[PDB]
Amino acid sequence: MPQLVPFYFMNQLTYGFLLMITLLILFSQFFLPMILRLYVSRLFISKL
């Protein structure tokens, strides 16, 4: 079955490993430090 055994494995794996590296960079440099900023901003007003 297509949802069991395909043979399209290298095609799949190419698009797959690309999605992982994209999300890794995207989270790490962009979206996570923008959460860390929310925390630090709340704390800076809290400190002041």
Partner 1 sequence: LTTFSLYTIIVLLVITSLYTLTNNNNKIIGSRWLISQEAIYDTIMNMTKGQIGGKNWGLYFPMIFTLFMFIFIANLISMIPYSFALSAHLVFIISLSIVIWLGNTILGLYKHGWVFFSLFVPAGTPLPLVPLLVIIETLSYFARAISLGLRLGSNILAGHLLMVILAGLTFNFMLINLFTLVFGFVPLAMILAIMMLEFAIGIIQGYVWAILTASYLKDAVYLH
Partner 2 sequence: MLKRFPTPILKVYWPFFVAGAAVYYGMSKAADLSSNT
Q: Is 17 in the site for partner 2 (CB under 8 A)?
A: yes
**Exposed / middle / buried, residue 2 (Cβ in 10 Å: 0-12, 13-18, 19+):** exposed
Total length of the chain: 48
What residues numbered 7-46 form the site for partner 1, per CB under 8 A? 8-9, 11-13, 15-16, 18-20, 22-24, 26-28, 30-32, 34-35, 37-38, 41-42, 45
Instruction: List the structure tokens of 46.
Output: 């809290």
For the chain, the first-to-last Cα distance in angstroms comes to 62
Instruction: List the structure tokens of 18.
Output: 């690309």
Which stretches of the chain bind partner 1, using CB under 8 A?
2-3, 6, 8-9, 11-13, 15-16, 18-20, 22-24, 26-28, 30-32, 34-35, 37-38, 41-42, 45
Which stretches of the chain bind partner 2, using CB under 8 A?
7-11, 13, 17, 24-25, 28-31, 33-34
